Amino acid sequence: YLGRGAPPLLDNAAAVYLRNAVVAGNRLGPAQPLPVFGCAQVPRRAGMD
Amino acid sequence: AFRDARGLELGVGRHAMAPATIAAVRGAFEDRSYPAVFYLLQAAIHGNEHVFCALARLVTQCITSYWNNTRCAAFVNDYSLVSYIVTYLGGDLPEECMAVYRDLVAHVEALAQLVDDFTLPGPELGGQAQAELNHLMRDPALLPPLVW
Amino acid sequence: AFRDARGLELGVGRHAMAPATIAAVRGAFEDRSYPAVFYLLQAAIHGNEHVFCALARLVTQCITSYWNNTRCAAFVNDYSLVSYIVTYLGGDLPEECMAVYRDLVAHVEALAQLVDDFTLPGPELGGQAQAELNHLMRDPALLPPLVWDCDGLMRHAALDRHRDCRIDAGGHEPVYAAACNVATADFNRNDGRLLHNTQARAADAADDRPHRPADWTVHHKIYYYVLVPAFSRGRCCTAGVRFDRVYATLQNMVVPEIAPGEECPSDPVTDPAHPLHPANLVANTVKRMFHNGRVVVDGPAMLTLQVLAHNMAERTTALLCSAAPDAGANTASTANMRIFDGALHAGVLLMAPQHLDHTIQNGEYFYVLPVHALFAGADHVANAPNFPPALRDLARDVPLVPPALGANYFSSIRQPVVQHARESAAGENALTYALMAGYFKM
Amino acid sequence: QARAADAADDRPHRPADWTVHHKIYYYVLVPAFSRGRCCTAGVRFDRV
Amino acid sequence: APQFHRPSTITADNVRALGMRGLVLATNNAQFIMDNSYPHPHGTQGAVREFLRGQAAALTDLGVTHANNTFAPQPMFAGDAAAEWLRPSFGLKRTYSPFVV
Amino acid sequence: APQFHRPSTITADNVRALGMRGLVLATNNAQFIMDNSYPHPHGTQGAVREFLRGQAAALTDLGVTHANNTFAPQPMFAGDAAAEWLRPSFGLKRTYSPFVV
Amino acid sequence: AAPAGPGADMQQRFLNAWRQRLAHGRVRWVAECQMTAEQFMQPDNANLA
């Protein structure tokens, strides 16, 4: 869900449910929307061991 | 060998049929001497409820006559029938073949609940439920082979 | 896998049931062919002991037929009945089903003395015992879902903890009466009256006193909350009963007149003077209902069915009352908390969900009302006479208790006990101690 | 349907569980017993 | 003679004077159309109050017709005896076969 | 009386006027060769239509012959009885032997 | 809720008046199908806090 290169599902009510169930807590979950021109920006955790 | 052990994995913890009642039902699938009045009653009742309690005396005699000859259950090709025998014909059968119809139905309801354990809750998507998107049996996209 | 593991820890060294008396009862809960005359008698007795010994031949024949029909017991939905059959019907039953009734009762008494092995003694705290602070089932804050008398609310009344009680049919405070007659009865009433008329004597009736010791309601609570989720595995529901509709067909009997100098009929098919003869099977009277679910009843046993006029109840009443956290959980941050509990002042436990039968119309005698998620069979809810079709997905994996009866967070027993009952792979002995230990307080 | 008194042109008689409990029977149970040796047939009802 | 399609007809005496056998088929051949021009004065729920005061009163009349079939009612339970200071109050199981030859 | 090897013969009352006992025997004692001199007007499948309409009316005449042996048909399921708003409607599993001595 | 009136349609008082808010949002407390290490993880368990 970071990088788009493919068409989504046709039912958009299905597409957001498939997307917000993955994204909702990942270490690599993207930002608020993805930008049209730009990058996913991959929000940083406060620390790493 | 993968797929069988994959069903060994899900098989514990939930209902398994008795090994006695398997040989009762399996012996009717291989029954070469199978009397065809049961096939003529099966086209007769044709998945109706009013016809079944009309012919309720005939069916409980035909099964009990068949149970005395072979230890098998004869109506087991039609699930619309087998549900009616459990629902309507509870009393007047010998109870061992009554449990043959009871266990086979109760193994279906254990398979219907297996989808509900594995399908997570969620919204309707495309007018269909979550388990209709997950598993094929709750999905109405496929339909049963004999629809009365 | 942990919660079962302490059940096996408690399972040794104390009483275990036979595998015979488990398969007899668990088949009786999953009996989709269940003859529904036992549900009408369960409402007809209405937990009154005096009605039991009156109908004692009819009860012992309805079982003996059903024991000859199936290898299952008959009245295992009602704990009072399973108590009374072992109590008053000790001789005249087939002995294979008598040990089923005998093993099932003492296994409750095994679970009742499980707590007293663990509870240290001491003084009395907040008007409660040491064990009532320890375990939930000795504690009369919780009261069972199916109550017939008023002993269950009485000990809940006499407390420093209770918030007075909310009856809701009429008025807030509940109210008691001595006895009920056919001219006194009001089969749909809006005043919140609770009948105390479940005792032995019709001559002895008290308005504000209990008939039974404390071992009566506790063994009820141990039966309903523990054994019922143990065997049924989440297909069971506790319905409200139309008593005016149930009583209307029991007393409507067609028994043919005996000839002068003739023997009592023992053959149901052959003899025309038998009430179960094919000549006597009339629609909407009781002997054909005895013929629908195939039950061997002779002449006088359905003739002693006239003991509904001496004792009957007018209707059922839903109940919702709260209680504070006990002495020992009562710091001022928690003292404003309430635990809502649901119950039924009359009502039966539906053992097997069925709507495919239409000897009784779907929704005549019973409306399902799951007071607790343990007693929320999905199929009972999904086959109401009006059930919304958009909820056919959501009711499949979720129990449905309305907030008039209680909430999941505000119940005494929250959700995962309901989940653990239907998901555990242990045997019904090993699950029982796993769930009996789950009811120790925190 | 249930009764001759109840005749529905498009109103449902049975739940969706009645459609699912049949599908599990023919697809899952029956081939585990029949071992592939079974066949579907149409019925000459005028002769039956 | 009560009419079971009308609410304001069923009383206690109209059901009790009709026999227990004569109440079976007469209610089975009544009118499906329920009249609504003259309701029961205590409501239709008040007629259900009044209708069951007639069936249960005829159960006692059924006990008179079968007094030569059953016996005298002995007390099933305790606390009830005439002489109590020398012998207690028994209580019988009625689990027998009530039948007079 | 019909000739069963001619398709233009059978009307629905030609089967019904014949008894059930001779309905088997005159169909056991017809002729092998199918005669096509005069065909049925609705087509040759119209005769099988016309034939089975009468056997069902031949069974309802046979049911009248056992009226001194069979009983009055109760409704098999609920929802159909006269008095419903005051007492419930049953339905009887017709599983017994309908028999008069 | 407080119960009101006859108990007969009290289930029906629940089913109809709640159906919009009941069927729409998913319940929180059905999390028993969540696994052990699927509990404490931040993906799919925003009900951690």
PDB file of N, CA, C and O in Angstrom, chain F residues 44-90:
ATOM      1  N   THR F  44     -49.501 -36.363 -29.606  1.00  0.00           N
ATOM      2  CA  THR F  44     -49.359 -37.655 -28.945  1.00  0.00           C
ATOM      3  C   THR F  44     -48.931 -37.514 -27.489  1.00  0.00           C
ATOM      4  O   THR F  44     -49.034 -38.480 -26.724  1.00  0.00           O
ATOM      5  N   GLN F  45     -48.434 -36.342 -27.089  1.00  0.00           N
ATOM      6  CA  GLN F  45     -48.179 -36.103 -25.674  1.00  0.00           C
ATOM      7  C   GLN F  45     -49.417 -35.603 -24.946  1.00  0.00           C
ATOM      8  O   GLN F  45     -49.417 -35.532 -23.712  1.00  0.00           O
ATOM      9  N   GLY F  46     -50.473 -35.251 -25.683  1.00  0.00           N
ATOM     10  CA  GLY F  46     -51.708 -34.851 -25.038  1.00  0.00           C
ATOM     11  C   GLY F  46     -52.452 -36.010 -24.411  1.00  0.00           C
ATOM     12  O   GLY F  46     -53.289 -35.810 -23.525  1.00  0.00           O
ATOM     13  N   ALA F  47     -52.159 -37.235 -24.851  1.00  0.00           N
ATOM     14  CA  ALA F  47     -52.841 -38.402 -24.304  1.00  0.00           C
ATOM     15  C   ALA F  47     -52.316 -38.772 -22.925  1.00  0.00           C
ATOM     16  O   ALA F  47     -53.091 -39.213 -22.070  1.00  0.00           O
ATOM     17  N   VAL F  48     -51.011 -38.610 -22.695  1.00  0.00           N
ATOM     18  CA  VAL F  48     -50.444 -38.881 -21.377  1.00  0.00           C
ATOM     19  C   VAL F  48     -50.922 -37.830 -20.380  1.00  0.00           C
ATOM     20  O   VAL F  48     -51.122 -38.121 -19.193  1.00  0.00           O
ATOM     21  N   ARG F  49     -51.134 -36.598 -20.858  1.00  0.00           N
ATOM     22  CA  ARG F  49     -51.794 -35.571 -20.057  1.00  0.00           C
ATOM     23  C   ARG F  49     -53.205 -35.992 -19.675  1.00  0.00           C
ATOM     24  O   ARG F  49     -53.587 -35.925 -18.503  1.00  0.00           O
ATOM     25  N   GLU F  50     -53.983 -36.451 -20.658  1.00  0.00           N
ATOM     26  CA  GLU F  50     -55.378 -36.800 -20.427  1.00  0.00           C
ATOM     27  C   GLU F  50     -55.509 -38.053 -19.568  1.00  0.00           C
ATOM     28  O   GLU F  50     -56.505 -38.220 -18.855  1.00  0.00           O
ATOM     29  N   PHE F  51     -54.497 -38.920 -19.590  1.00  0.00           N
ATOM     30  CA  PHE F  51     -54.585 -40.186 -18.875  1.00  0.00           C
ATOM     31  C   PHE F  51     -54.368 -40.013 -17.378  1.00  0.00           C
ATOM     32  O   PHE F  51     -55.100 -40.597 -16.572  1.00  0.00           O
ATOM     33  N   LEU F  52     -53.360 -39.233 -16.984  1.00  0.00           N
ATOM     34  CA  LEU F  52     -53.041 -39.095 -15.568  1.00  0.00           C
ATOM     35  C   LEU F  52     -53.968 -38.137 -14.838  1.00  0.00           C
ATOM     36  O   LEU F  52     -53.964 -38.125 -13.602  1.00  0.00           O
ATOM     37  N   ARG F  53     -54.761 -37.341 -15.560  1.00  0.00           N
ATOM     38  CA  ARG F  53     -55.775 -36.523 -14.905  1.00  0.00           C
ATOM     39  C   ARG F  53     -56.872 -37.373 -14.273  1.00  0.00           C
ATOM     40  O   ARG F  53     -57.513 -36.924 -13.318  1.00  0.00           O
ATOM     41  N   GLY F  54     -57.089 -38.586 -14.775  1.00  0.00           N
ATOM     42  CA  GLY F  54     -58.179 -39.423 -14.324  1.00  0.00           C
ATOM     43  C   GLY F  54     -57.819 -40.410 -13.234  1.00  0.00           C
ATOM     44  O   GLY F  54     -58.695 -40.815 -12.465  1.00  0.00           O
ATOM     45  N   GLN F  55     -56.549 -40.823 -13.170  1.00  0.00           N
ATOM     46  CA  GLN F  55     -56.126 -41.735 -12.112  1.00  0.00           C
ATOM     47  C   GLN F  55     -56.178 -41.061 -10.750  1.00  0.00           C
ATOM     48  O   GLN F  55     -56.479 -41.706  -9.741  1.00  0.00           O
ATOM     49  N   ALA F  56     -55.877 -39.763 -10.700  1.00  0.00           N
ATOM     50  CA  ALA F  56     -55.986 -39.031  -9.444  1.00  0.00           C
ATOM     51  C   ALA F  56     -57.437 -38.870  -9.017  1.00  0.00           C
ATOM     52  O   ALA F  56     -57.741 -38.925  -7.821  1.00  0.00           O
ATOM     53  N   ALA F  57     -58.346 -38.682  -9.976  1.00  0.00           N
ATOM     54  CA  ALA F  57     -59.765 -38.704  -9.654  1.00  0.00           C
ATOM     55  C   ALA F  57     -60.267 -40.119  -9.419  1.00  0.00           C
ATOM     56  O   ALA F  57     -61.325 -40.296  -8.809  1.00  0.00           O
ATOM     57  N   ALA F  58     -59.536 -41.129  -9.891  1.00  0.00           N
ATOM     58  CA  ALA F  58     -59.841 -42.505  -9.532  1.00  0.00           C
ATOM     59  C   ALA F  58     -59.362 -42.857  -8.135  1.00  0.00           C
ATOM     60  O   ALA F  58     -59.878 -43.807  -7.536  1.00  0.00           O
ATOM     61  N   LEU F  59     -58.388 -42.118  -7.607  1.00  0.00           N
ATOM     62  CA  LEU F  59     -57.975 -42.339  -6.228  1.00  0.00           C
ATOM     63  C   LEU F  59     -58.939 -41.677  -5.256  1.00  0.00           C
ATOM     64  O   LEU F  59     -59.197 -42.211  -4.171  1.00  0.00           O
ATOM     65  N   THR F  60     -59.474 -40.511  -5.624  1.00  0.00           N
ATOM     66  CA  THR F  60     -60.433 -39.832  -4.760  1.00  0.00           C
ATOM     67  C   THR F  60     -61.767 -40.562  -4.715  1.00  0.00           C
ATOM     68  O   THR F  60     -62.499 -40.449  -3.728  1.00  0.00           O
ATOM     69  N   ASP F  61     -62.106 -41.308  -5.767  1.00  0.00           N
ATOM     70  CA  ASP F  61     -63.228 -42.229  -5.659  1.00  0.00           C
ATOM     71  C   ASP F  61     -62.869 -43.428  -4.795  1.00  0.00           C
ATOM     72  O   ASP F  61     -63.735 -43.968  -4.098  1.00  0.00           O
ATOM     73  N   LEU F  62     -61.603 -43.850  -4.821  1.00  0.00           N
ATOM     74  CA  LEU F  62     -61.177 -44.967  -3.986  1.00  0.00           C
ATOM     75  C   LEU F  62     -61.091 -44.557  -2.521  1.00  0.00           C
ATOM     76  O   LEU F  62     -61.292 -45.383  -1.625  1.00  0.00           O
ATOM     77  N   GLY F  63     -60.809 -43.279  -2.260  1.00  0.00           N
ATOM     78  CA  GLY F  63     -60.820 -42.794  -0.891  1.00  0.00           C
ATOM     79  C   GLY F  63     -62.206 -42.750  -0.282  1.00  0.00           C
ATOM     80  O   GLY F  63     -62.361 -42.943   0.927  1.00  0.00           O
ATOM     81  N   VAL F  64     -63.228 -42.491  -1.103  1.00  0.00           N
ATOM     82  CA  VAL F  64     -64.613 -42.553  -0.641  1.00  0.00           C
ATOM     83  C   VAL F  64     -65.021 -43.973  -0.284  1.00  0.00           C
ATOM     84  O   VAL F  64     -65.795 -44.170   0.662  1.00  0.00           O
ATOM     85  N   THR F  65     -64.465 -44.980  -0.962  1.00  0.00           N
ATOM     86  CA  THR F  65     -64.760 -46.373  -0.646  1.00  0.00           C
ATOM     87  C   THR F  65     -64.235 -46.804   0.716  1.00  0.00           C
ATOM     88  O   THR F  65     -64.703 -47.815   1.249  1.00  0.00           O
ATOM     89  N   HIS F  66     -63.289 -46.066   1.296  1.00  0.00           N
ATOM     90  CA  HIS F  66     -62.774 -46.354   2.627  1.00  0.00           C
ATOM     91  C   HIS F  66     -63.234 -45.324   3.657  1.00  0.00           C
ATOM     92  O   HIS F  66     -62.567 -45.140   4.681  1.00  0.00           O
ATOM     93  N   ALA F  67     -64.362 -44.646   3.405  1.00  0.00           N
ATOM     94  CA  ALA F  67     -64.869 -43.642   4.338  1.00  0.00           C
ATOM     95  C   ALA F  67     -65.384 -44.258   5.629  1.00  0.00           C
ATOM     96  O   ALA F  67     -65.430 -43.567   6.653  1.00  0.00           O
ATOM     97  N   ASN F  68     -65.771 -45.532   5.607  1.00  0.00           N
ATOM     98  CA  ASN F  68     -66.072 -46.277   6.820  1.00  0.00           C
ATOM     99  C   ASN F  68     -64.828 -46.895   7.447  1.00  0.00           C
ATOM    100  O   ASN F  68     -64.952 -47.695   8.381  1.00  0.00           O
ATOM    101  N   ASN F  69     -63.641 -46.547   6.951  1.00  0.00           N
ATOM    102  CA  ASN F  69     -62.387 -46.970   7.556  1.00  0.00           C
ATOM    103  C   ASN F  69     -61.447 -45.814   7.887  1.00  0.00           C
ATOM    104  O   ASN F  69     -60.671 -45.936   8.841  1.00  0.00           O
ATOM    105  N   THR F  70     -61.506 -44.695   7.165  1.00  0.00           N
ATOM    106  CA  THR F  70     -60.631 -43.549   7.385  1.00  0.00           C
ATOM    107  C   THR F  70     -61.377 -42.453   8.141  1.00  0.00           C
ATOM    108  O   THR F  70     -62.602 -42.486   8.290  1.00  0.00           O
ATOM    109  N   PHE F  71     -60.627 -41.460   8.610  1.00  0.00           N
ATOM    110  CA  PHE F  71     -61.179 -40.434   9.480  1.00  0.00           C
ATOM    111  C   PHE F  71     -61.129 -39.054   8.833  1.00  0.00           C
ATOM    112  O   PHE F  71     -60.616 -38.869   7.728  1.00  0.00           O
ATOM    113  N   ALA F  72     -61.679 -38.080   9.559  1.00  0.00           N
ATOM    114  CA  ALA F  72     -61.786 -36.713   9.064  1.00  0.00           C
ATOM    115  C   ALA F  72     -60.410 -36.060   9.037  1.00  0.00           C
ATOM    116  O   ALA F  72     -59.717 -36.062  10.060  1.00  0.00           O
ATOM    117  N   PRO F  73     -59.979 -35.502   7.904  1.00  0.00           N
ATOM    118  CA  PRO F  73     -58.603 -34.998   7.806  1.00  0.00           C
ATOM    119  C   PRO F  73     -58.401 -33.702   8.581  1.00  0.00           C
ATOM    120  O   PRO F  73     -58.937 -32.652   8.223  1.00  0.00           O
ATOM    121  N   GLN F  74     -57.622 -33.793   9.655  1.00  0.00           N
ATOM    122  CA  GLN F  74     -57.151 -32.655  10.427  1.00  0.00           C
ATOM    123  C   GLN F  74     -56.073 -31.920   9.644  1.00  0.00           C
ATOM    124  O   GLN F  74     -55.432 -32.506   8.768  1.00  0.00           O
ATOM    125  N   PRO F  75     -55.861 -30.627   9.901  1.00  0.00           N
ATOM    126  CA  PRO F  75     -54.767 -29.928   9.225  1.00  0.00           C
ATOM    127  C   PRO F  75     -53.419 -30.453   9.684  1.00  0.00           C
ATOM    128  O   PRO F  75     -53.196 -30.742  10.860  1.00  0.00           O
ATOM    129  N   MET F  76     -52.522 -30.612   8.717  1.00  0.00           N
ATOM    130  CA  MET F  76     -51.220 -31.190   9.005  1.00  0.00           C
ATOM    131  C   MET F  76     -50.305 -30.248   9.758  1.00  0.00           C
ATOM    132  O   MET F  76     -49.414 -30.711  10.475  1.00  0.00           O
ATOM    133  N   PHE F  77     -50.484 -28.943   9.608  1.00  0.00           N
ATOM    134  CA  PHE F  77     -49.602 -27.986  10.244  1.00  0.00           C
ATOM    135  C   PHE F  77     -50.435 -26.846  10.805  1.00  0.00           C
ATOM    136  O   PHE F  77     -51.651 -26.780  10.616  1.00  0.00           O
ATOM    137  N   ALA F  78     -49.764 -25.934  11.498  1.00  0.00           N
ATOM    138  CA  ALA F  78     -50.467 -24.866  12.182  1.00  0.00           C
ATOM    139  C   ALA F  78     -50.876 -23.762  11.205  1.00  0.00           C
ATOM    140  O   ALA F  78     -50.746 -23.880   9.983  1.00  0.00           O
ATOM    141  N   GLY F  79     -51.387 -22.671  11.772  1.00  0.00           N
ATOM    142  CA  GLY F  79     -51.836 -21.542  10.992  1.00  0.00           C
ATOM    143  C   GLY F  79     -53.242 -21.650  10.446  1.00  0.00           C
ATOM    144  O   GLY F  79     -53.770 -20.644   9.951  1.00  0.00           O
ATOM    145  N   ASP F  80     -53.873 -22.821  10.522  1.00  0.00           N
ATOM    146  CA  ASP F  80     -55.226 -23.022  10.006  1.00  0.00           C
ATOM    147  C   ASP F  80     -56.051 -23.775  11.045  1.00  0.00           C
ATOM    148  O   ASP F  80     -56.023 -25.006  11.117  1.00  0.00           O
ATOM    149  N   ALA F  81     -56.770 -23.011  11.857  1.00  0.00           N
ATOM    150  CA  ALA F  81     -57.827 -23.511  12.721  1.00  0.00           C
ATOM    151  C   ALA F  81     -58.770 -22.348  12.967  1.00  0.00           C
ATOM    152  O   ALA F  81     -58.385 -21.197  12.761  1.00  0.00           O
ATOM    153  N   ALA F  82     -59.987 -22.648  13.422  1.00  0.00           N
ATOM    154  CA  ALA F  82     -61.036 -21.634  13.440  1.00  0.00           C
ATOM    155  C   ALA F  82     -60.777 -20.565  14.496  1.00  0.00           C
ATOM    156  O   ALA F  82     -60.590 -19.388  14.166  1.00  0.00           O
ATOM    157  N   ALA F  83     -60.746 -20.951  15.765  1.00  0.00           N
ATOM    158  CA  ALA F  83     -60.508 -20.005  16.853  1.00  0.00           C
ATOM    159  C   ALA F  83     -59.003 -19.923  17.061  1.00  0.00           C
ATOM    160  O   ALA F  83     -58.364 -20.870  17.516  1.00  0.00           O
ATOM    161  N   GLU F  84     -58.431 -18.773  16.707  1.00  0.00           N
ATOM    162  CA  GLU F  84     -56.995 -18.563  16.791  1.00  0.00           C
ATOM    163  C   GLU F  84     -56.582 -17.477  17.769  1.00  0.00           C
ATOM    164  O   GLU F  84     -55.521 -17.597  18.386  1.00  0.00           O
ATOM    165  N   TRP F  85     -57.391 -16.438  17.936  1.00  0.00           N
ATOM    166  CA  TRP F  85     -57.019 -15.309  18.773  1.00  0.00           C
ATOM    167  C   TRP F  85     -57.186 -15.590  20.260  1.00  0.00           C
ATOM    168  O   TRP F  85     -56.712 -14.796  21.080  1.00  0.00           O
ATOM    169  N   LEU F  86     -57.832 -16.693  20.625  1.00  0.00           N
ATOM    170  CA  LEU F  86     -58.061 -17.051  22.020  1.00  0.00           C
ATOM    171  C   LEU F  86     -57.395 -18.358  22.413  1.00  0.00           C
ATOM    172  O   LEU F  86     -57.129 -18.582  23.598  1.00  0.00           O
ATOM    173  N   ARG F  87     -57.133 -19.230  21.448  1.00  0.00           N
ATOM    174  CA  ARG F  87     -56.487 -20.513  21.633  1.00  0.00           C
ATOM    175  C   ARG F  87     -55.648 -20.824  20.397  1.00  0.00           C
ATOM    176  O   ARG F  87     -55.937 -20.312  19.317  1.00  0.00           O
ATOM    177  N   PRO F  88     -54.583 -21.615  20.519  1.00  0.00           N
ATOM    178  CA  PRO F  88     -53.704 -21.795  19.358  1.00  0.00           C
ATOM    179  C   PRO F  88     -54.206 -22.811  18.347  1.00  0.00           C
ATOM    180  O   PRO F  88     -55.177 -23.540  18.576  1.00  0.00           O
ATOM    181  N   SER F  89     -53.521 -22.850  17.212  1.00  0.00           N
ATOM    182  CA  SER F  89     -53.808 -23.760  16.117  1.00  0.00           C
ATOM    183  C   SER F  89     -52.703 -24.802  16.078  1.00  0.00           C
ATOM    184  O   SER F  89     -51.526 -24.447  15.972  1.00  0.00           O
ATOM    185  N   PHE F  90     -53.066 -26.073  16.170  1.00  0.00           N
ATOM    186  CA  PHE F  90     -52.061 -27.118  16.061  1.00  0.00           C
ATOM    187  C   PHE F  90     -51.964 -27.592  14.617  1.00  0.00           C
ATOM    188  O   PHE F  90     -52.510 -26.988  13.690  1.00  0.00           O
TER     189      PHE F  90
END
